[PDB]
Design a protein around this nucleic acid. Structure first.
Lengths: 136, 117, 62
RNA sequence: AGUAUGGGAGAGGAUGGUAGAAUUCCAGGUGUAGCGGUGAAAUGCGUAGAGAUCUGGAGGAAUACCGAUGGCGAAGGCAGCCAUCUGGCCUAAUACUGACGCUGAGGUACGAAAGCAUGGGGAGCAAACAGGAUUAGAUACCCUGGUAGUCCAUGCCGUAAACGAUGUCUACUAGCCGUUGGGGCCUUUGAGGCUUUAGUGGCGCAGCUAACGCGAUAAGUAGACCGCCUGGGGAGUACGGUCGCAAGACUAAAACUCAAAUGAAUUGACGGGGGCCCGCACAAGCGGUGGAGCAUGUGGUUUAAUUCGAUGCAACGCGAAGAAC
């Protein structure tokens, strides 16, 4: 602003898992107010990862998020925690968009599973940030 | 081929460049690198990052001759003196002593005219 | 002649040397040597410095 | 006002030696692809080897720190250290001469920098000039080079915002705070505190001034002598003369033309002056336009007519909330 400090806007927990992380991911996926489509996409992927490995959807998602989380931007300085997660979700949706499959939910589940082993364009971009950070 | 344990580093840091020269004692050159030799053409030659890059290359080159402890002399009011001296420790030498040897005239020759920019 | 003792780090050595050079003030002479200063300008600058010094002394006295 | 005797401070002057730092060049080792420079570049230097680093040599010019609102000198000016020759100033007490004083038209001496003459010297810097940039153009500012000159000896020139924009000499008129060179007193042991004198600074009463300001270093109160001014231009110009090798300097008008030209301060406005502050101004984000097809308005062109108005932001889906008659 210039004079004031504006508080962050608190988002409600997801009504199905009570997960603010899942709610934020849904908000990142959603376009032009179509919340139902984003909910379907996210829930389908959460069920798919559960079948393809029997793991808890919430814990598996947090672990993959922490794996794809950067640590630094760029002038080196320490990125604040919220921006880390905000940047990780953007990479995870962008890279998932470019796979070839029938539905967005299946692509999201597939690349979540792929990133759980460190294989994916998001992790590659993370290594790129690591390299250019070593540059500075 | 020649092996020497104790060496001297010279950081000539001007406002347009920085030259890092590694020699033994009695001033016989062993390895050197400048910001111009790693790209960084034009005005970017004076950045501290280029000085660090040149210092790393020079230290790694001298590691072949096999120095472990060295004495550092910095001359010139360059922006890359601190980066050049820091990069040597990162490379892995032991800086026994580091000093400033910039020359000062005792009211000698006349310097050039002032720029009316 | 910053001679390091047994176990200071490189950064500590750098900062201590920077403090020593700041105390020595060699860079001021190097900057002064870049261009020629005419005696008129030198006298004007020294007169201004003396005036500022005397103004500072009265302020510190009060 | 001056003289003799003791002591003191100082980049005062002239001559001759000598020391260290640094720049340039040269010779030689180590060593290998850049160096240099700018807002960004380029001209330029370099593989017949630079730049960097080490050793030695040559030469010229200037004296870091001390360094100071310090010091000395009539002014111009004077800074490493040492010797020789030499001028002035401050300070104490007696002694001595007895108005020997102040100013000064003509005259005469000194007089920054640039410039001139004869002979030397030449590191760095650098008018003129050459090239590279920038620009609509660049003749300039910026960059790479570079000759006079800057230095020495012997002479000339005689001008500067040569300024404190304040002629020299004398006496008197509240105070407060610094600093330089001396004298005296007091403590009391060694560092301080009071006075007095000659300089050098900052405030300020009275007084003065158009105001700004000055104010014992007067622009106050008075006295002595000298120089100079009489609206702005033409004009420190022409003619004549004197001086100078020259460049030029000094003395110095008129015709003609205008009703102004100036000083200080006040209110605004502006500044590619400075501080502080705000705004989707930027920063962080999410969507667009600029590309395609179509709708609509404008410019242009065309036409018998393509009715008229709106033109940077603040005109262009605007007047028109609706042209087949």
């Amino acid at each position: 602003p210039r004079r004031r400090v504006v508080a962050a806007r608190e988002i409600l927990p997801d009504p199905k898992f009570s997960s603010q992380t899942i709610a934020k991911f849904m908000n990142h996926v959603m376009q032009d107010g179509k919340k139902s489509i984003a909910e379907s996409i996210v829930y389908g992927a959460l069920e798919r990862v559960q079948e393809k490995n029997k793991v808890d959807p919430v814990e598996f998602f947090e672990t993959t998020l922490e794996k794809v989380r950067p640590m630094v931007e760029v002038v080196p300085m320490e990125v604040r925690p919220s921006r880390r997660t905000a940047l990780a979700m953007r990479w995870l949706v962008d890279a998932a968009a470019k796979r070839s499959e029938k539905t967005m939910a299946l692509r999201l589940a597939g690349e979540l599973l792929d990133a759980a082993e460190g294989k994916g364009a998001a992790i590659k971009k993370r290594e790129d940030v690591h390299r250019m950070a070593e540059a500075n | 081929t020649r092996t020497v344990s104790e060496g001297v580093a010279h950081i000539h840091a001007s406002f347009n460049n920085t030259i890092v020269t590694i020699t033994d004692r009695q001033g016989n050159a062993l390895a050197w690198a400048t910001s111009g030799g790693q790209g960084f053409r034009g005005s970017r030659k004076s950045t501290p990052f280029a000085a660090q890059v040149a210092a790393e290359v020079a230290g790694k080159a001298a590691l072949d001759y096999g120095l472990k402890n060295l004495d550092v002399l910095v001359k010139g009011p360059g922006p890359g003196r601190e980066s050049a001296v820091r990069a040597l420790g990162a490379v892995g030498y032991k800086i026994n002593s580091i000093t400033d040897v910039t020359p000062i005239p005792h009211n000698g020759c006349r310097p050039p005219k002032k720029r009316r920019v | 002649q910053v001679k390091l003792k047994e176990g200071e780090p490189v950064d500590v050595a750098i900062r201590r040397f920077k403090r020593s050079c700041e105390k020595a003030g060699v860079l001021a002479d190097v900057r002064k040597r870049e261009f020629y200063e005419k005696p008129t300008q030198e006298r004007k600058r020294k007169k201004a410095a003396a005036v500022k010094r005397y103004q500072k002394k009265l302020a510190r006295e009060s």
